[PDB]
Design a protein around this nucleic acid. Structure first.
Ligand SMILES: Nc1ncnc2c1ncn2[C@@H]1O[C@H](COP(=O)(O)OP(=O)(O)O)[C@@H](O)[C@H]1O
Ligand code: ALF
Ligand SMILES: [Mg+2]
Lengths: 80, 439, 74, 93, 109, 98, 73
DNA sequence: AGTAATCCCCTTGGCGGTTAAAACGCGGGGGACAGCGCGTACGTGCGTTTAAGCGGTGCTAGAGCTTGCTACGACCAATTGAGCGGCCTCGGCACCGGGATTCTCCA
DNA sequence: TGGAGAATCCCGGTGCCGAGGCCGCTCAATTGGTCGTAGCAAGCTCTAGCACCGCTTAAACGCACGTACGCGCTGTCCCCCGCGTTTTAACCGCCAAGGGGATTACTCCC
């Protein structure tokens, strides 16, 4: 499936520009994909844990915000 | 009569208009309870056209229907008054929001320029949009097949009861239904000042509030419903299942489950678990065998047939059988979208190459014409007898092209016997509780 | 690692800003000291990685400042 | 029926900047901000009551919470605003 | 039965002392909620809301905007040292970042 | 001969474009599919609100943008202008993710 | 009043804390940088520890007040 | 009171296109990185002295616990108006285009 | 220093959609009275925090001095940037489906 490759090289470039980065080793791109999914693999499992424990068969915006808040990355704008 | 109709009323309908006008001008409500297919949907238009021509009320009129009838209303309203302005309040929520822009609250009586005179909507929409149906006031309301209201515990009774409507008219096929308190809910709905909560007295107190003509006295050219209760027989697979399932009654003491589980295998054993060939599939149901034989005889006869099913999964199994043979067909059940209902009914009525129409008992039973069929087969029967009667009279109807015949595929010795026996009992009871024109 | 008495006096000196003539339970001093030693040890670890990353072996003030900046302490 | 701080945020906005609007997405962040800081204070006030073995969340609990959760000058200004709001609620009813 | 006037009006606040009383009860933070505790808290919530919107209204004015935007909240919150410390672990939806280019990255002579 | 900006000039022009802006920088549909994949790894036949995958995207992008800053400081702390994987690995170890 | 007791965490003590962190060699400018770190830390612990103390209208700071201050870190 | 049909709504999936974003190729430049020389700045060892640590003595602030009651919040029913959902509109902001000003780079 | 040209800015115009205000109403906030109790108050106990003295010796400091290592310099080469080309899949719209949740009917059991 490998939609992690859908996080393309120009997108990781654009994110590094906003992060203020001038010059990027071509090895950075595969490292950045590995770091992004390890993030998602924690937030979604907690967001799903909320949907499961609250007995709904859909994932809502607020499930994510609780999942983020519980790991210290409070997000304002999506409820919260 | 209002010349606005661009149509004649029939003799009996014109006296019906006079009754409905008399109740309105005397400030009281009533039930138009004429037999199925006599034209209650037309008398309903005639009174609006009179309120237009005689008093210039021109609405707002609310007209609440079962969903499969909503296109019957939209079209026939446009036929029986070409100049009426009709709001079709149905669709997705975004579409209703666009439609609701025309609900002018500021005039309690509509000008003839007003963007509608009459509004057609589903019995589900009046409860789903109740907060929008409140904050509005109606000069008249039709409930287009009011046996939907017969449960006083139904929300669509609680809601439509209080719509702030100056007069109300119910149309019904036969109002008596299961019992008398289920009649009182319909009587209380029209006149809650009078009725609130012996069977000789009723005929003399319903007479002012009901009109109840019958198709022996009316449309005499509609020759009688020829009927053949078939009393066909199980096949070996079904009776192996039936015996294994009837054993459960002996172990019991769960009929609330088993009557469905019995009737499932009464219909076709593949509904319970699937078998690989049409020879087995046709012959392992006693009904489907006798149906396939009769459908061959009918198609050689040039007949066109309506089949009613109680279980929609049997409409799928029947649709396999039909596609594994030479038969062109339509399907209409409660899973279809309303535009598919409009078009499939129009398609069937358009062209005689279509042999068979599959209809679900309720979704397909209530109130739109199928007057170019000639044969009705109840592959399964409704356990309330009144709903099978409406289904029969979707064929046996004004404009019916040819002598109707009706078949019912009773499986001897099964739970199907109890059901048709009790439907036979209940239709007798319903003629204890009514006999007489009313007025 | 830190001498106990000069840490007490450091605690007293700092506390006098917030409320004059507070008292400190003897166990409360040790709870502060054992947290400060653990905090400084754990920061010097993070600075040593900064030195080693910049190919130094000698830790330097810009290593402390990078450690704190990435930990979000500044 | 949901509940929002939007009407109260507007009535603060129109005091500090009577000319200035707020977009719905910005108002969303104001709701999230009020919810998050209300719960952060109430959480500390709960713990301060719990630590003291007290059944009551007093204004004293919220004062000590505010002096923990806010930076030094926001703390003092907020403590000032809070102490006079109560002092005017007292001497009324 | 006297003419009711809101606990907010008596406290002198826009923020709802009523909701803050209810929500301090519904959350079961403690068994009992004082009468003034919702007042003190509702005052701090109102004050901090004014701190955000004052600086964000200035930033909106700097952008030549009439109307506050999540961008302007982020700029205000990060420019002010204390709001930045109060919100140093909060992500603001569509906030973006502060413009900041490290000095070494700018071009040489 | 074509005119040509020097190496690193348009990197600065790009920094001044993606800073000073708020647009999402990861394409919407690819992120949805990656999220649905990771969801399948945990619970099949889930569903997501649109605002849930938006909320999840905003948190991710802010995490990556904020991470790059810490790696840029690691790169710039060594003699380098170029970030390398060992800078991500140091940054995440100083943060305590690693 | 007391003064300059931040010079009570001596340079050998900073060596021990750095060697326990694995440091091999220490710039002579680290020793003052370490004090600017320890002081800013220990101030904001004690600020909360005292705020927890005075809330109970007491005057000794307890180990529990320290624990709640650290728990706020 | 149960179980199945009917109907709404809202999410997922597919199809087509259109164009904006990703991928690919290629020259060259300048930044990564290994190598070198020096010099100064940090680790080491010794003699010095300083005060941290321990054992011991003395006092009183105040932590911690009990008793007694009344001020204050929990609980309920009746009253009402502050706050929410729905509908409308016009003006703020974006988006475009075109000429003006700025900035970068090779000469 | 100049210049050419690309990139960034500005000024006015267009239009669309969402911000700001109005309307109906509900139900959540407020008024009034009751009643229980908890924690604010006065009072006793004695823990342990603070202060001081005197001794011991291990820890801290100042200094000598050697060499290990930080830093600026030089050379190279490789690899990531800037720009044109090629191509692919993201975006948009419209239609289908299915699923699930609420409601309604009818029968059996109590
Ligand atoms: N007076 C009339 N003139 C022409 N057609 C009529 C008249 N009355 C009834 N019909 C036809 O009878 C058919 C069925 O009538 P309807 O009122 O729908 O039956 P139901 O009583 O079930 O509603 C309709 O197609 C309608 O056109
Ligand atoms: F009145 Al009918 F079918 F009988 F609509
Ligand atoms: Mg009809």
């Amino acid at each position: 499936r490998d939609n992690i490759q859908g996080i393309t090289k120009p997108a990781i470039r654009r994110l590094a520009r906003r992060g203020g980065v001038k010059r990027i080793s071509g090895l950075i791109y595969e490292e950045t994909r590995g770091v992004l999914k390890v993030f998602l693999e924690n937030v979604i499992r907690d967001a799903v844990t909320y949907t499961e424990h609250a007995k709904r068969k859909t994932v809502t915006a607020m499930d994510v915000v609780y999942a983020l808040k519980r790991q210290g990355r409070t997000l304002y704008g999506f409820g919260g | 009569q209002p010349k606005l109709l661009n149509c004649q009323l029939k003799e009996y309908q014109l006296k019906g208009l006079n009754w409905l006008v008399n109740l309105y001008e005397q400030g009281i409500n009533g039930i138009l309870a004429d037999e199925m297919g006599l034209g209650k949907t037309v008398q309903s238009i005639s009174v609006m056209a009179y309120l237009a021509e005689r008093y210039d009320i021109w609405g707002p009129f609310l007209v609440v229907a079962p969903a499969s009838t909503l296109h019957n209303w939209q079209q026939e309203v446009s036929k029986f008054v070409p100049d009426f302005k009709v709001l079709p309040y149905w669709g997705t929520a975004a579409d209703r929001k666009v439609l609701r822009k025309f609900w002018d609250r500021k005039h309690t009586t509509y000008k003839k320029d007003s963007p509608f005179h009459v509004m057609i909507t589903s019995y589900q929409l009046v409860v789903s949009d109740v907060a929008y149906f409140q904050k509005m006031k109606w000069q008249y309301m039709i409930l287009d097949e009011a046996q939907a209201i017969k449960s006083s515990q139904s929300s669509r009774w609680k809601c439509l009861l209080g719509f702030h409507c100056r007069n109300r008219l119910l149309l019904t096929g036969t109002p008596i239904q299961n019992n008398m308190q289920e009649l009182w809910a319909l009587l209380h709905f029209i006149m809650p000042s009078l009725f609130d909560s012996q069977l000789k007295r009723l005929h003399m107190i319903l007479k002012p509030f009901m009109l109840r003509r019958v198709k022996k006295h009316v449309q005499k050219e509609l020759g009688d419903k020829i009927e053949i209760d078939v009393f066909c027989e199980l096949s070996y697979r079904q009776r192996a299942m039936y015996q294994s399932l009837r054993n459960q009654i002996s172990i019991m003491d769960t009929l609330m489950n088993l009557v469905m589980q019995f009737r499932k295998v009464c219909n076709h054993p593949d509904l319970f678990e699937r078998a690989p060939s049409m020879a087995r599939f046709v012959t392992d149901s006693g009904k489907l065998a006798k149906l396939d034989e009769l459908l061959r005889e009918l198609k050689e006869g040039g007949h066109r047939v309506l089949l009613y099913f109680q279980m929609t999964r049997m409409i799928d199994l029947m649709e396999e059988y039909l596609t594994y043979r030479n038969y062109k067909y339509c399907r209409l059940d409660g899973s279809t979208k309303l535009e598919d209902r409009r078009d499939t009914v129009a398609d069937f009525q358009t062209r005689p190459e279509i042999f068979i129409f599959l209809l679900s008992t309720r979704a397909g039973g209530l109130g739109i014409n199928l007057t170019t069929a000639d044969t009705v087969i109840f592959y399964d029967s409704d356990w309330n007898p009144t709903i099978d009667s409406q289904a029969m009279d979707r064929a046996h109807r004004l404009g019916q092209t040819k002598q109707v015949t009706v078949y019912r595929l009773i499986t001897r010795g099964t739970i199907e016997e109890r059901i048709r026996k009790r439907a036979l009992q209940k239709e007798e009871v319903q003629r204890v509780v009514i006999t007489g024109t009313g007025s | 690692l830190i001498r106990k008495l000069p840490f007490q006096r450091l605690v007293r000196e700092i506390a006098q800003d917030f409320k004059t003539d507070l008292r400190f339970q003897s166990s409360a001093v040790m709870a502060l000291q054992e947290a400060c030693e653990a905090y400084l040890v754990g920061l010097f670890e993070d600075t040593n990685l900064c030195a080693i990353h910049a190919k130094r072996v000698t830790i330097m003030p810009k290593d402390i400042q990078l450690a704190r900046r990435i930990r979000g302490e500044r | 029926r949901k509940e929002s701080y939007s009407v109260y945020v507007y009535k603060v906005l129109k005091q500090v900047h009577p000319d200035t609007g707020i977009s719905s997405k910005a108002m969303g962040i104001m709701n999230s901000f009020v919810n998050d800081i209300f719960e952060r204070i109430a959480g500390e006030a709960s713990r301060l009551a719990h630590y003291n073995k007290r059944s009551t969340i007093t204004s004293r609990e919220i004062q000590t919470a505010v002096r923990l959760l806010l930076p030094g000058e926001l703390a003092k200004h907020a403590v000032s605003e809070g102490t006079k709001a109560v002092t005017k609620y007292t001497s009324s009813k | 039965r006297a003419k009711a006037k809101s606990r907010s009006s008596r406290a002198g606040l826009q923020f709802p002392v009523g909701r803050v009383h209810r929500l301090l009860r519904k959350g079961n933070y403690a068994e009992r909620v004082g009468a003034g505790a919702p007042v003190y808290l509702a005052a701090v919530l109102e004050y901090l809301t004014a701190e955000i919107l004052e600086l964000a209204g200035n930033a909106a004015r700097d952008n030549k905007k009439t109307r506050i935007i999540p961008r302007h909240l982020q700029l205000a919150i990060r420019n002010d040292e204390e709001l930045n410390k109060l919100l140093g672990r909060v992500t603001i939806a569509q906030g973006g970042v502060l413009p900041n280019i490290q000095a070494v990255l700018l071009p040489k002579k | 001969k074509p005119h040509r900006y020097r190496p690193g000039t348009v990197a600065l022009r790009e920094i001044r474009r993606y800073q000073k802006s708020t647009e999402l920088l990861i394409r919407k549909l690819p992120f949805q599919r990656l999220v649905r994949e990771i969801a399948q790894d945990f619970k099949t036949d889930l569903r997501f609100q649109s605002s849930a995958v938006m909320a999840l995207q905003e948190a991710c992008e802010a995490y990556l943008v904020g991470l790059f800053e810490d790696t840029n400081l690691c790169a710039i702390h060594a003699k380098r202008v170029t970030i390398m994987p060992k800078d991500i690995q140091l940054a995440r170890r100083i943060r305590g993710e690693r």
